[PDB]
Amino acid sequence: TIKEMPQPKTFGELKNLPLLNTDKPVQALMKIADELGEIFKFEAPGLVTRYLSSQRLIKEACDESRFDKNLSQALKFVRDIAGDGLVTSWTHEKNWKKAHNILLPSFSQQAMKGYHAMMVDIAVQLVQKWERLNADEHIEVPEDMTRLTLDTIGLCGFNYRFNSFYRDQPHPFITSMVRALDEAMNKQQRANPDDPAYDENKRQFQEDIKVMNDLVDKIIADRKASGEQSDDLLTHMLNGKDPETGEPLDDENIRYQIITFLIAGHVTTSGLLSFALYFLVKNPHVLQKAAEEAARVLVDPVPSYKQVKQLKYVGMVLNEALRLWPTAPAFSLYAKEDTVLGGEYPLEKGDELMVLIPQLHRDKTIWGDDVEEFRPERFENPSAIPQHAFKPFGNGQRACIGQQFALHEATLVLGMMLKHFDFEDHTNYELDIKETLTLKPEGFVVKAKSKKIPLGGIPS
């Protein structure tokens, strides 16, 4: 049964473009979904896409034989930063599967066990940072989470210490990255991108890329004059070869993956931890139930790998935070061939789809009407959830390669946070979600009273 697909207001030649003229476009989209329903057509000068919001339509979109990963307009712009790295490369593109084969061992199970000791190294620094604050001082939550997450991927991934906790301004890499990513997001609303009104923007962009590449230069150089070295993500990135082709990555594609993992390896994880701590202070009974598990499981000066894997309610807290606000709010898909979606919406070949993940996670036919409420108990049994109902990490072979990395780090750190501190909503923070292609609550500050529980010595 063919259906006519709804479409919001069109402003003439600009079509639906002026609707996304906001600091918060994803949220503007979610409200559009609330009016228009399962699916709606969205076009602008350039191309057309279709935003899905129901589990009914998305589980069909997640069929890898009917649909493949599409680079949305945003990704096509991010591609100017990350090139043909794992994130911004097409599925059937040369360097994707090549690097997918080379780098997947770096996120294997015994790769994770290797990262743990270093993950704790940074986690301790976060705790001690807070242990050493004065009585009056506030904790800027997303700022410090970014320090932790960036330093973790920098150390675990490349054996490079950003030393973010030795700076009270963000690292030069961060500032250039945020500007470059904000530019990619801002260029979407740009009528004539090559209008000289944005020469000013293109000049700052070339500079931010200079700064970011200057750091990749440091990482590769430090590895040169080393002799340990040894076996991390950069090691595979430099020496590994694709089994199917017997080829290593270019001198060029390597630089793209480093930039890819320096950005992707922290940008969304920082948001998750921030959203988790936000919901916890806004829901104190949840906070204490998780604080108990933290105190119960973590019985040593430093958490072990097994102990992190036993923080089950904490993991649920993280998953529920990812439900309400997936810090990677969307991914795109294209029809491999002609097909029908849900037996109602006929798609041509190459037609583009957008998975609106926060609205998917609010599907009342899956979760009930208490969708906006923060109950970690939804995930107390994983199998209870329909397939393709919970998609904070993408789908299929294009799903997040660092999903376990993020979740292990986030659980470990949140576990130590709850073992060592109580938390006060010092400002009664009104949630203000900042969008930079990713979701993150800005202006969020808390206060921590230490439980005076000692730490220990860092492993290896």
Catalytic position from the list 62, 67, 146, 400: 400
Partner whose footprint covers residue 1, from ligand HEM, ligand MYT, Ni ion, none (CB < 5 to 8 Å by kind): Ni ion
Q: Provide, rounded to whole angstroms, the least separation between the CB of residue 97 and ligand HEM.
A: 8
Q: Dihedrals φ, ψ of 439, to 5°? A: -100, 135
Q: Provide, rounded to whole angstroms, the least separation between the CB of residue 204 and ligand HEM.
A: 26
Catalytic position from the list 152, 268, 411, 438: 268
CA atoms within 13 A on the CB side of 147: 23
Taking a C-beta distance cutoff of 8 angstroms, is the pair 414, 272 a contact? no
Q: Would you state the structure tokens that stand for residue 262, as one six-digit string?
A: 């320096």
61 near ligand HEM (CB under 6 A): no
Q: Which of 19, 58, 81, 86 binds ligand HEM (CB under 6 A)?
A: 86
277 near ligand HEM (CB under 6 A): no
Q: What are the residues whose beta carbons fall under 8 Å from the beta carbon of 441, sequence distance 6 or more? A: 141, 142, 271, 274, 275, 278, 429, 431, 432, 433, 434
> Quick check: is 40 catalytic?
no
> Alpha-carbon distance 342 to 328, whole Å?
25
Instruction: Choose between 32 and 87: whose C-beta lies nearer to ligand MYT.
Output: 87
Helical (H) or strand (E) element with 184: helix 172-186
Sheet with 352-356, edge to edge strand ranges: 39-43, 48-52, 352-356, 330-335, 67-70
**Interacting stretch for ligand HEM, rule CB under 6 A, among 134-142, 165-173, 245-253, 263-271?**
263-271
Binding site annotation covers 400?
Answer: yes
Does the N-terminal peptide bond of residue 229 adopt cis geometry, omega within 30 degrees of 0? Answer: yes
214 near Ni ion (CB under 5 A): yes
> Quick check: is 11 catalytic?
no
69 near ligand HEM (CB under 6 A): yes
Partner whose footprint covers residue 333, from ligand HEM, ligand MYT, Ni ion, none (CB < 5 to 8 Å by kind): none
3-state secondary structure at position 380? coil
CA distances from 66 to 57, 316, 396 (A): 13, 32, 12
CA distances from 364 to 55, 280, 355, 440 (A): 10, 23, 17, 24
Instruction: Choose between 112 and 124: whose C-beta lies nearer to ligand HEM.
Output: 112
Instruction: Choose between 192 and 428: whose C-beta lies nearer to Ni ion.
Output: 428
398 near ligand HEM (CB under 6 A): yes
87 near ligand HEM (CB under 6 A): yes
Question: How far is CA 219 from its chain centroid?
Answer: 23
β-strands 439-441, 433-435 pairing: antiparallel
1 near Ni ion (CB under 5 A): yes
Instruction: Choose between 1 and 109: whose C-beta lies nearer to Ni ion.
Output: 1
Binding site annotation covers 160?
Answer: no
**Interacting stretch for Ni ion, rule CB under 5 A, among 180-188, 227-235, 279-287, 322-330?**
227-235
Site residues, ligand MYT (CB under 6 A): 78, 87, 181, 263-264, 267-268, 328, 400, 437-438
Instruction: Choose between 15 and 248: whose C-beta lies nearer to ligand HEM.
Output: 248
> Quick check: is 62 catalytic?
no
Q: Provide, rounded to whole angstroms, the least separation between the CB of residue 405 and ligand MYT.
A: 10
Q: Give bridge partners of residue 70 from the DSSP assignment.
A: 332
Closest listed residue to residue 121, CA positions, set 94, 82, 160, 92: 160
**What is the binding site for ligand HEM (CB under 6 A)?**
69, 86-87, 100, 153, 260-261, 264-265, 268-269, 272, 326-328, 331, 392-394, 398, 400-402, 405-406
Binding residues for heme: 400
- Residues marked as catalytic: 268, 393, 400
